[PDB]
User: Fold UDP-N-Acetylenolpyruvylglucosamine Reductase from Thermus caldophilus.
Amino acid sequence: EFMRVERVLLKDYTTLGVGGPAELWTVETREELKRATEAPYRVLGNGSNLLVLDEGVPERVIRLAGEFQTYDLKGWVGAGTLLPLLVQEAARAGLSGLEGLLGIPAQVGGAVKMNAGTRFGEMADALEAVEVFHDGAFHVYCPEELGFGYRKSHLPPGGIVTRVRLKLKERPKEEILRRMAEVDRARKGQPKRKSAGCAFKNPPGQSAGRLIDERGLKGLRVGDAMISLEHGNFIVNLGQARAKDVLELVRRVQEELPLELEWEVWP
Ligand SMILES: Cc1cc2nc3c(=O)[nH]c(=O)nc-3n(C[C@H](O)[C@H](O)[C@H](O)COP(=O)(O)OP(=O)(O)OC[C@H]3O[C@@H](n4cnc5c(N)ncnc54)[C@H](O)[C@@H]3O)c2cc1C
Ligand SMILES: [Ca+2]
Assistant:
């Protein structure tokens, strides 16, 4: 009954660095989660796939912390745990199964919601069980029950991923690290770092980054929003970008290429 609730700007809680006002509820316990979800809500993970508009959102924005950030690689892993932590912890433990998720700056819950992945593997591959809170109760699902597709899930309506069990296998630490090194090599062309990740989806048999590059769109700038000079499928925030500027740049790309956004827009 004593969870932290505060007014924030979502620009401070997204990797893109844009976003207006929201009421943030930081939940540490199952009872606090039950209370936070009594009115309309959204769940915020690491904010790495969100384009939040300058007006912000009116709903309660829930962050999972406390018990939801504790983990055991061989047991339950809280959904508020950072996926980059688990990738490194698995290597340390000689546990294979997360290597293909290197470089994805997600919380576990966000990685499940967006079935985050690379050419090497996806979040769904690494799951044994998923606890989802919906309709006022906690339920346990196998991943085959969650409607996974390419960078997609079909969670129960209003579902909050709270905890998972991972599917991992014993391998030599050095081998795990070699696999991770290939993932790192494959990601070398992405910006030395800053964004909400890939802005656009790839059309069937096409590449968004390559298409944007060939169209000469790298370097186009609206205010402080710019198509990265390093990778065509990244829009970067050069300092004080507004979401309006990012959307304008998106529209400019879409005037040239029939691309759909990979980012989710709030509200
Ligand atoms: C530098 C960079 C590189 C990236 N590379 C990749 C990549 O290689 N592959 C890839 O797939 N994606 C990539 N992304 C996109 C992004 O990291 C993924 O979509 C990631 O899964 C989002 O997780 P998040 O915790 O940041 O979620 P957020 O952006 O916070 O939220 C995304 C969605 O998940 C929901 N959500 C968050 N937590 C929960 C929860 N506990 N329960 C239910 N719903 C929840 C939110 O409501 C929202 O709908 C990249 C992003 C960046 C910035
Ligand atoms: Ca079940």
Summary: The radius of gyration is 19 Å. Residues 15, 42-50, 64, 79, 103-107, 109-111, 113-114, 116-118, 151, 160-161, 195-197, 264 surround flavin-adenine dinucleotide (ligand 1) (CB under 6 Å). Residues 173-186 form the longest helix (14 residues). The domain at 191-267 is CATH 3.90.78.10 (Uridine Diphospho-n-acetylenolpyruvylglucosamine Reductase; domain 1).
